[PDB]
Design an enzyme around this catalytic site. Sequence first.
Site, PDB file in Angstrom:
ATOM      1  N   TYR A  44      28.441 -20.319 -33.702  1.00  0.00           N
ATOM      2  CA  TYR A  44      29.618 -19.544 -34.081  1.00  0.00           C
ATOM      3  C   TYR A  44      29.955 -19.738 -35.555  1.00  0.00           C
ATOM      4  O   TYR A  44      30.031 -18.771 -36.322  1.00  0.00           O
ATOM      5  CB  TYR A  44      30.807 -19.937 -33.196  1.00  0.00           C
ATOM      6  N   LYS A  79      37.403 -24.910 -38.545  1.00  0.00           N
ATOM      7  CA  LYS A  79      36.224 -24.185 -38.092  1.00  0.00           C
ATOM      8  C   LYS A  79      36.262 -22.790 -38.701  1.00  0.00           C
ATOM      9  O   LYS A  79      37.260 -22.078 -38.554  1.00  0.00           O
ATOM     10  CB  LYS A  79      36.217 -24.111 -36.564  1.00  0.00           C
ATOM     11  CG  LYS A  79      34.973 -23.495 -35.948  1.00  0.00           C
ATOM     12  CD  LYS A  79      35.087 -23.523 -34.435  1.00  0.00           C
ATOM     13  CE  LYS A  79      33.792 -23.160 -33.780  1.00  0.00           C
ATOM     14  NZ  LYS A  79      33.759 -23.818 -32.457  1.00  0.00           N
ATOM     15  N   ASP A 122      31.523 -24.576 -21.465  1.00  0.00           N
ATOM     16  CA  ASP A 122      30.414 -25.160 -22.221  1.00  0.00           C
ATOM     17  C   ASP A 122      30.682 -26.623 -22.533  1.00  0.00           C
ATOM     18  O   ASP A 122      30.497 -27.085 -23.661  1.00  0.00           O
ATOM     19  CB  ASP A 122      30.105 -24.387 -23.506  1.00  0.00           C
ATOM     20  CG  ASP A 122      28.751 -24.751 -24.102  1.00  0.00           C
ATOM     21  OD1 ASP A 122      27.864 -25.243 -23.365  1.00  0.00           O
ATOM     22  OD2 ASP A 122      28.575 -24.554 -25.326  1.00  0.00           O
ATOM     23  N   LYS A 150      30.059 -30.471 -22.997  1.00  0.00           N
ATOM     24  CA  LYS A 150      28.920 -31.281 -23.375  1.00  0.00           C
ATOM     25  C   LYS A 150      29.461 -32.456 -24.151  1.00  0.00           C
ATOM     26  O   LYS A 150      30.620 -32.424 -24.611  1.00  0.00           O
ATOM     27  CB  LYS A 150      27.916 -30.498 -24.222  1.00  0.00           C
ATOM     28  CG  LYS A 150      28.421 -30.019 -25.574  1.00  0.00           C
ATOM     29  CD  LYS A 150      27.454 -29.036 -26.227  1.00  0.00           C
ATOM     30  CE  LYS A 150      28.026 -27.635 -26.200  1.00  0.00           C
ATOM     31  NZ  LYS A 150      27.178 -26.725 -27.011  1.00  0.00           N
ATOM     32  N   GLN A 204      29.213 -33.442 -27.067  1.00  0.00           N
ATOM     33  CA  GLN A 204      29.664 -33.144 -28.426  1.00  0.00           C
ATOM     34  C   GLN A 204      31.017 -32.469 -28.454  1.00  0.00           C
ATOM     35  O   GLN A 204      31.652 -32.463 -29.521  1.00  0.00           O
ATOM     36  CB  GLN A 204      28.651 -32.257 -29.147  1.00  0.00           C
ATOM     37  CG  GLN A 204      27.404 -32.991 -29.582  1.00  0.00           C
ATOM     38  CD  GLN A 204      26.276 -32.870 -28.553  1.00  0.00           C
ATOM     39  OE1 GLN A 204      26.498 -32.562 -27.366  1.00  0.00           O
ATOM     40  NE2 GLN A 204      25.052 -33.095 -29.012  1.00  0.00           N
TER      41      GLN A 204
HETATM   42  C1  LIG Z   1      33.550 -29.791 -31.014  1.00  0.00           C
HETATM   43  C2  LIG Z   1      32.563 -29.346 -32.068  1.00  0.00           C
HETATM   44  C3  LIG Z   1      31.308 -28.898 -31.301  1.00  0.00           C
HETATM   45  C4  LIG Z   1      30.903 -27.654 -32.104  1.00  0.00           C
HETATM   46  C5  LIG Z   1      32.260 -26.971 -32.403  1.00  0.00           C
HETATM   47  N1  LIG Z   1      33.197 -28.113 -32.572  1.00  0.00           N
HETATM   48  C6  LIG Z   1      34.440 -27.879 -33.042  1.00  0.00           C
HETATM   49  O1  LIG Z   1      34.727 -26.728 -33.341  1.00  0.00           O
HETATM   50  C7  LIG Z   1      35.437 -28.945 -33.309  1.00  0.00           C
HETATM   51  C8  LIG Z   1      36.813 -28.836 -33.018  1.00  0.00           C
HETATM   52  C9  LIG Z   1      37.664 -29.863 -33.306  1.00  0.00           C
HETATM   53  C10 LIG Z   1      37.164 -31.046 -33.887  1.00  0.00           C
HETATM   54  C11 LIG Z   1      38.018 -32.132 -34.186  1.00  0.00           C
HETATM   55  N2  LIG Z   1      37.513 -33.231 -34.738  1.00  0.00           N
HETATM   56  C12 LIG Z   1      36.212 -33.330 -35.000  1.00  0.00           C
HETATM   57  N3  LIG Z   1      35.758 -34.510 -35.537  1.00  0.00           N
HETATM   58  C13 LIG Z   1      34.346 -34.889 -35.563  1.00  0.00           C
HETATM   59  C14 LIG Z   1      34.256 -36.101 -36.499  1.00  0.00           C
HETATM   60  C15 LIG Z   1      32.804 -36.566 -36.628  1.00  0.00           C
HETATM   61  N4  LIG Z   1      32.197 -36.797 -35.302  1.00  0.00           N
HETATM   62  S1  LIG Z   1      31.014 -37.896 -35.114  1.00  0.00           S
HETATM   63  C16 LIG Z   1      29.559 -36.907 -35.360  1.00  0.00           C
HETATM   64  O2  LIG Z   1      30.974 -38.357 -33.738  1.00  0.00           O
HETATM   65  O3  LIG Z   1      31.125 -38.879 -36.182  1.00  0.00           O
HETATM   66  C17 LIG Z   1      32.432 -35.806 -34.240  1.00  0.00           C
HETATM   67  C18 LIG Z   1      33.882 -35.343 -34.178  1.00  0.00           C
HETATM   68  N5  LIG Z   1      35.354 -32.350 -34.756  1.00  0.00           N
HETATM   69  C19 LIG Z   1      35.792 -31.180 -34.207  1.00  0.00           C
HETATM   70  C20 LIG Z   1      34.930 -30.112 -33.903  1.00  0.00           C
END
Ligand SMILES: C[C@H]1CCCN1C(=O)c1ccc2cnc(NC3CCN(S(C)(=O)=O)CC3)nc2c1
Length: 290
Positions: free
Chosen positions: A16, A34, A119, A121, A123
């Site tokens: 996306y 995002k 979906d 998972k 992650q």
């Molecule tokens: C969930 C993902 C899967 C792909 C789309 N999507 C998001 O739209 C999304 C939404 C909120 C978030 C909040 N917060 C964080 N924070 C990240 C910090 C770094 N880490 S990590 C790799 O474990 O260090 C993972 C979490 N991401 C987000 C992502």
Amino acid sequence: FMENFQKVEKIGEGTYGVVYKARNKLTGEVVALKKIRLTAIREISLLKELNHPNIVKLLDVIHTENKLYLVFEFLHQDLKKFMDASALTGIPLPLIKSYLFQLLQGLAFCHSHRVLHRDLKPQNLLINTEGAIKLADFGLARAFGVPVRTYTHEVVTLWYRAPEILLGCKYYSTAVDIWSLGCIFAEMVTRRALFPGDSEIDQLFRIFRTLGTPDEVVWPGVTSMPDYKPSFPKWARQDFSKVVPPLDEDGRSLLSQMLHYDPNKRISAKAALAHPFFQDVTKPVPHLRL
Ligand SMILES: C[C@H]1CCCN1C(=O)c1ccc2cnc(NC3CCN(S(C)(=O)=O)CC3)nc2c1
């Protein structure tokens, strides 16, 4: 708008759009931003009101130009990274139990408002230092969608997909989220993915080889599903003591109910919260390296 956010670093790339850690210059808030490259506006607006402690909060929705930006609460790690960090020792059972309980609370809430994730998972399960875990990035199967050209090559993971989706049902239920969560529960316990398929048929056949090829006895109507073929091989069901060995009989009973083939037999989130496996649930502090 975008001028109101200072990007800190890219934290993710998807089909996306890309997600950045960013600072809101007006509030000082650190957020996940995002960017989605291009009904949906209304379906997203509804998600803004779907507020629960176990659901990552959608803070703001910005529609400008040909781009849609979603601003989310930021959490510092996901369950995939935490499982990888914990792979030598295993996540302790009490923390597995706490995470499963909290995710079922989040699912019971969303499902009660007729919202599916679709979906789940590792992650999209996000964790913090206090022991909380939260569902992120609800999928809109009925609306939404945008161009993926700029979005880097990304193979969609099938490992957590419910069998009714793989068999071509288009009007599936909240039960698909319980299936995914059951797969994640198994993976936390055993430290290996339950069904790591690399194509739709490999995913289906890995499910069949463990749970048995479904038939009309266990799943009335399975043989009339859109992608069902009579030529599917017939494999016998295996025992859950072999499948998630370390886990006790309360855990195995609950997992079995979360992995029922018939979505109408599959346990609901609300009923799962009452399962005897949660008799001794607590909220431990995880060891998070940030
Ligand atoms: C969930 C993902 C899967 C792909 C789309 N999507 C998001 O739209 C999304 C939404 C909120 C978030 C909040 N917060 C964080 N924070 C990240 C910090 C770094 N880490 S990590 C790799 O474990 O260090 C993972 C979490 N991401 C987000 C992502």
